[PDB]
Amino acid sequence: SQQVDKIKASYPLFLDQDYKDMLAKKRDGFEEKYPQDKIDEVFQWTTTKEYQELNFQREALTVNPAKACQPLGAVLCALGFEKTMPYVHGSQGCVAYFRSYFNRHFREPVSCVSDSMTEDAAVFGGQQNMKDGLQNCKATYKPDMIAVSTTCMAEVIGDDLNAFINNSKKEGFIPDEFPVPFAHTPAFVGSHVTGWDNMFEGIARYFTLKSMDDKVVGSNKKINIVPGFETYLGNFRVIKRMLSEMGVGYSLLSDPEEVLDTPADGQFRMYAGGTTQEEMKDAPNALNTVLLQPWHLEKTKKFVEGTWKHEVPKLNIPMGLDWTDEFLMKVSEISGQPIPASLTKERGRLVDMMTDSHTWLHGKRFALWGDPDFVMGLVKFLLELGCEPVHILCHNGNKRWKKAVDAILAASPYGKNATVYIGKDLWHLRSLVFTDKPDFMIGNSYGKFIQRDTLHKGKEFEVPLIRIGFPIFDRHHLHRSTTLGYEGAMQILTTLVNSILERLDEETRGMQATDYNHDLVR
Amino acid sequence: SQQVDKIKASYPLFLDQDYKDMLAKKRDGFEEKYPQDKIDEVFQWTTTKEYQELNFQREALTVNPAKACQPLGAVLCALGFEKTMPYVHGSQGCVAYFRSYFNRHFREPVSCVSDSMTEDAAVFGGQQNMKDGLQNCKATYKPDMIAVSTTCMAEVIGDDLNAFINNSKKEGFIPDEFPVPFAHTPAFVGSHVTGWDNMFEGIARYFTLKSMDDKVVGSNKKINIVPGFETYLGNFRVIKRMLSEMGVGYSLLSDPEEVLDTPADGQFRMYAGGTTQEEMKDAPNALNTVLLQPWHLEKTKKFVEGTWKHEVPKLNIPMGLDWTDEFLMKVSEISGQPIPASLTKERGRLVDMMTDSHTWLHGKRFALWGDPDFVMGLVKFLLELGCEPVHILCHNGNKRWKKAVDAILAASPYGKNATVYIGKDLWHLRSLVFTDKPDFMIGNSYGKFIQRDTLHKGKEFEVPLIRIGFPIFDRHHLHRSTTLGYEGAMQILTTLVNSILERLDEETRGMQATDYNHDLVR
Amino acid sequence: SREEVESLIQEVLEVYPEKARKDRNKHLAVNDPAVTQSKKCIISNKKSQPGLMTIRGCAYAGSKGVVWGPIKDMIHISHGPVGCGQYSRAGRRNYYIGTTGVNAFVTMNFTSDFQEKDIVFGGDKKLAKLIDEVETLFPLNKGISVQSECPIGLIGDDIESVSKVKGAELSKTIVPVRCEGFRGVSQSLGHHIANDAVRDWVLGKRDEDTTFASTPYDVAIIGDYNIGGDAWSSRILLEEMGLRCVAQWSGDGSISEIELTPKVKLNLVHCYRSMNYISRHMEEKYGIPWMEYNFFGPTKTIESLRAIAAKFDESIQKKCEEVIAKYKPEWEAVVAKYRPRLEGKRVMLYIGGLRPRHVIGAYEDLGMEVVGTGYEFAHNDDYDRTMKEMGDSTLLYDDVTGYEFEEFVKRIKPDLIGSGIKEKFIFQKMGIPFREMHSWDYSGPYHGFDGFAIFARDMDMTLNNPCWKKLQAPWE
Amino acid sequence: SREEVESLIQEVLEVYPEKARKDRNKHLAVNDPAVTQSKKCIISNKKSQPGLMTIRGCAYAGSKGVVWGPIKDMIHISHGPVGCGQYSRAGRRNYYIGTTGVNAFVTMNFTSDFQEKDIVFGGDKKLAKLIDEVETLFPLNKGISVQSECPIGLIGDDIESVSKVKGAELSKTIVPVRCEGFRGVSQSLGHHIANDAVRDWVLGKRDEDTFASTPYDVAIIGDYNIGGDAWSSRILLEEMGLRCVAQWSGDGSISEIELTPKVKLNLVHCYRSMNYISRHMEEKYGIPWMEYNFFGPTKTIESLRAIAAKFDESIQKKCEEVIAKYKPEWEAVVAKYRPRLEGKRVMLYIGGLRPRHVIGAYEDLGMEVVGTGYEFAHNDDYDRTMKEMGDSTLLYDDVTGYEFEEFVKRIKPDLIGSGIKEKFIFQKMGIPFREMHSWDYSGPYHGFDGFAIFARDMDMTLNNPCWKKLQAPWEA
Ligand code: ICS
Ligand code: ICS
Ligand SMILES: [Fe+3]
Ligand SMILES: [Fe+3]
Ligand code: NA
Ligand code: NA
Structure with missing residues (x-):
């Protein structure tokens, strides 16, 4: 039943007695459920060290993985380029999952297309899918670039991405000068971050491999920044902010920050911001390239050092106090800009927060x-x-x-x-x-x-x-947060200490039982 | 007892059986406690509509007030001025409470002084306290200004602040040109926000009342901003940020943002930042004065309109979407600067968040x-x-x-x-x-x-x-937050929706009871 | 209208290349009450055109995510690389009662996590070892299903041999399902593949069992996946009417419920598209008749209850009117409050294989008008049923492209859009109220009388929300 | 360094004007092993010099915040304007067991909220109406106290007349307390004023009463149960065979207070705040009192033995059983934490007892107190301080903010133990700080169980990694 002025959603509607009786009638009649004592007994067993040893002996079964497949990262990487459509050569189901997956984390539109390879392409290849796909994509959604990855279907059968794209241009399906960088992104290799690496390196060589002759390291007086797989808007913004504060010229290569946070002002914008083709073309003229997340940018690093001849410095991710320090010091050395008073003060503000909160965080x-x-x-x-x-x-x-x-x-x-x-x-x-x-x-x-x-x-x-x-699906707008730099460290500290204090308040909220420690001041 | 490797603080130490038995013996032996059934009965009674009617008939008793006394606001206002020492004429106990109260909210030093009036000042006045106080304060702590308010003791006996300060200068306890603005701040009138108003208007009169001859409204092409009693660092920062973004010249009159957030870098800084004496001197030359919190800035408004001849616009506090809009539009009209693309986009980003989260916030x-x-x-x-x-x-x-x-x-x-x-x-x-x-x-x-x-x-x-x-004593570093403007609206929205979702997760965390609604995606 | 609708379609297709142009024109039509056979009006169930941003999923989603995954006391293996199982973990709200990780497993993700070695050597050995590890760590599972992802068939694995061997060795129900995402053109084929898997490996288990105590009012709910509790808020009405719901396919369903379904007197089919296959098979083999019903809104729910009751005796029909009379004041209060706030407002729908037509009656019970609808993967038999429910001169789009839906909405300018998660944030930015019509936007149930109250609440809260008049800054 | 200490003092006082300079020099001394009469060494309990940022509070804090407020089953009225009661609401962790708002009220703020009308007309009428409203809304209160704030005496109100009249009319204990903040020079007089209020209005209630007494009845006088300090002290005393009839005033009930004249011995922890009522109980009831110290194992063991020596051999036998029981526990604490703290120098500045009372606990961890001082102690406290402090220590009475800062920059202790107004000053200077009033929201620190927490707290802060990060690597 429902009371019109206090409508119940699934919770707590189904806690009503008539639903409770119905659900018990369903179970006892036709579910042949294990008895509760047995369910209890097995659950307790799943919490034991004995169960853990059996659990860690697994070799073939994976349960609740903490990773995704390559093409998911190739899509996020491609979204960071100006008016660029991510394009996944293979089956359409994956693309629906990639878009949905990112939809729910950012609570924003996510544009990505497939060329819908089916059983027919499973025997003859996706060549025709590629030619009609590229032409249909360019005409309908008018990108300035199409960045191509693969689903595991396309990888198993062996579609030659380079040859298929070359044929699409030769046969007139897409303009010859229309940029179509590509990368193979097999799901059975690595994880979603490997796809990001593969996609980026594919885009970087497309715009630079054949044009190295007129390149001079340092001639543009900038530093390239490669962010890697990044799902916090604040992490793109804090890096650009700290470098502007330092007066450091930079190019953030792959920057989805705009397209993942367009305003709601009555019009939909499929594309927004992003790294420009000219920034990729000109990147080898930078003083150096900094990799924000080196442990999943190995392929990128080999290309930037092998072809651009940059000397990529050995920096950890700029997280926490020591590694943000080291990041800023290495940038100062490369760029010759001194670390400014504003970042020094921000650092001292993070330290002050640490000293203020260390008693609750310790241990x-x-x-x-x-x-x-x-x-x-x-x-x-x-x-x-x-x-x-x-x-x-x-x-x-x-x-x-x-x-x-x-x-x-x-x-x-x-x-x-x-x-x-x-x-x-x-x-x-x-x-x-x-x-x-x-x-x-x-x-x-x-x-x-x-x-x-x-x-x-x-x-x-x-x-x-x-x-x-990542992903965070059950809270709203935490994708705006920051984890890098002093700003991210300050945000993480506050979240940690207050989760501790929130739990302490809950455990001391019992009137006359535990609230002797329900202090007003913490 | 204690186990050395898992030491227990008060919670949960006193839940040990021997403490539990000890506490029960104390109660039954010597406390003559009301029986638990009676406590339960009375508690249930305090939750009834009957109790509420008796509760709201109170006229003389106040229980758990949500306000403080004037001089607390005068101190916060004075802290917003460059190298200014807040000085409360009267008894020293109040000053210890003012500092402690602000210490715990900002988790920072709070510098404020008393002239320690006692029973002896109750028969002759605190004149001598003022003369020695001003001289001792200036020499020891080297402020550029001393802003004087009053404790309720000084108000009852009737100390003439103006005469006492004038005599201190005449008799040579402080240099004649040393600025000593003052305000009477009686605790039995209004609340802490009235003290802010009284103090500010006192400082504004000190630097401008006698110098109006050479003043021309608009001649400096700035807008004065009066923030009022404000305990969120982000609210000082967001206002300055939005005005710089617009290219608007402004003077933020009373700005404690720096002194309430000094870095931990091995040295203590009693003073930092703040409005300069000269910004106060020159403020009547502004185009206009905007009051961010008009409902506790009535005395200030009369002075800026009566003496500075400014036409203070009728603006609500810039909170939420509509009132931030109106604030920016009125600033654009006064300054002639257009609202820039960056704030329009920020506004549209706030609206997007509203549309994304409206289903959980509604009702x-x-x-x-x-x-x-x-x-x-x-x-x-x-x-x-x-x-x-x-x-x-x-x-x-x-x-x-x-x-x-x-x-x-x-x-x-x-x-x-x-x-x-x-x-x-x-x-x-x-x-x-x-x-x-x-x-x-x-x-x-x-x-x-x-x-x-x-x-x-x-x-x-x-x-x-x-x-x-305000005050928030049982969480760390929420004083860094923002509540004004689109930024503040975004923070408040996020906090509200996720408090709803955190509570829903708690109510649906019950295995096989309520977790049918323990969704991964919200 | 009508002529401006036909004109809008041709206008939109002027951007496509010649080939897509021609194909997309086959999937875009304007309704007409003088035509009854949709095979003469619109084409459906065809391959998607490459690169046009279809909203469709794959056959794996149709089998694992839709049909098999909800069955709660079974463990479902996503057999292949890690992606498919992770993206579909707990994204669909097929609600259930159980102790997850102990005797129920719906929201978990079991996966073989294909590495390149399994591509070159095959995964059948790994699957057999995987099944053994499942038995060790989850002893209370009552069966296992193997949901094949794209690589399985492409490399020549034989999961049916593994299923037969391990099933006998363990005395366990192990269902092989060949729902590789490259099969078919959409989720639709995954439905059919999955239905045949139930028939071939589960449904016949109790053909020779006579230990079940039948009544003349035994019935099964076929094709309701208990999104937000939709099936529970339908079961309650059926049993208040005097029926005994033996089984629920597959929302909150147990394998034993599946096995007992051949013992019922009547199959009640909500989702025709995903479950008409197994329904037809049960009629042929067990003589069980089936009927379509609709529990969206009071009008369709009352009519459904009466049609269902007419299949039984006068005692069930008397209880039918007792239920209708019981809930009458409740849904009347809902309409009295929310119909004034929604009447005359125009809605556009785009969903999967049933709801684009099935929820129309509920919108009209609130005074609203559905001016356009369409499916991702429906067949022409669904479109036959759609024209009887849709109004004259409505707009009909099959496998709509992202560009098409956008342009169609820009001109029609509906007051509300009901579609999926990939569409939601597009139209919110356009200033058009949006309601998720798969996940119910994490609300619901929407079935039955209790669901209508939540549905009416949800449409009103979004359409009339103050956020929508704030899209334009006062300064331009 | 003795001579370098005297030199530091004169250097620091070179900034003061002539008058303050001369006065402050009386309150700054270097301790010396040949001195029992501290009045030959330092002056104390004098008015603060204006404008030098004393850390002292007022008499109201001494009476309401310290003595009376902790008594849990009474309602304490902050009589005056709204400030005093709000700033002191629940800022002090005098812990208690009760149902707040029903039968206990410690953390609530009751106030008359003086408006200007009550200034011109007086507040005695408002107080009487206020007392009636308290009776209606909080019937289970067992008495009321009236804590006078600054205006009460200045305007000529007579709260003792209101207390007498309403007390008889209601048959209630209503205690008037004239602790106006302008009285005295610090919190110290609030202690004394409050003690006399207990004597004059509470303590005589049961003189002619009804009590079953035992030879081991005792009272804990001057322990306010900061973080549970008194509970972790009571446990040891009752393990030793004693019966703690009353706890003044930490977690204290009015009935406990009234029964205290029936005990055989008064155990005084805080001499400063409670020696007044202790002397009075000896004169009138013949009850002897003794000072004890429960900070650290050395002082706790010694106190237990001294306390037990006042009774018979059976209490002395249990005393050794208690010492033997906890011996391995505090030995493990020192074995773990003494190596991590030995040789580190501490500076203290607190209120009226702990600047000397906690020294023994620091030395039990190998630490050295190189400087201490009080806000409001008298010369009798400083007599006791010299015996506990080391040779050539630095001694500061009513230290100014400038003094403490300058003293610390030169001595450079490894740890500072003081109050909330000092904490964040020295943290920014890169000096580990522990609150020694609130225990930094930790504790208890009394007893064997408190020593473990104390040692844990000093170690976590002094050795914390944050302290090596104050200097940016590029700013050296
Ligand atoms: S099964 Fe089908 S797409 Fe009939 S695949 Fe899809 S839970 Fe839709 S319109 Mo998601 S044919 Fe069910 C459906 Fe309808 S997942 Fe749900 S909402 S009624
Ligand atoms: S009562 Fe005194 S200032 Fe003896 S007013 Fe003060 S809870 Fe201090 S050094 Mo806060 S004479 Fe108690 C004290 Fe000591 S409030 Fe506590 S810590 S042992
Ligand atoms: Fe969004
Ligand atoms: Fe701080
Ligand atoms: Na996949
Ligand atoms: Na006060």
């Missing part, structure tokens, strides 16, 4: 996951705050990366109880937070189901989730 | 309190979001102000169930949230005790607090 234990560069930056900053990053999980990490993070942990007393996991998923992590319970999780929205599982064991065993990463 | 019922200008700006923005501001409480509001807010409510369907209360306190509000339960509270840290009381009745009756206002 706090965290489980966390995400992409490699993001994870190690988070690990570094936690150590700087006096926190203990107990469970460090990077599903798409590698042994080389794990070795570097272990060295970071070994250089601090707060990493003594920390372990780094690679190739493991969030079902692995679920066991860790039962057997070696931390205080909080830092991760994406998929972690909310780990919190639900811990609460079911008991309130005292609950591990609350702090949402930092 | 949500709120109780809220604070200062008058802040409260009406919050009410306006909630109406713009499709929320219902059900209980609007402004302890230090007046009938004129309540009438203006009622007109705002009457002009929207979402104000149909709203009531505005003036002269009522948070014990009044506690009754309202029991008898006419809203979905959330928006208020300062004192609201955490209303949330605790509601939970005690039952989880289904709990009204969670959303911390926006």
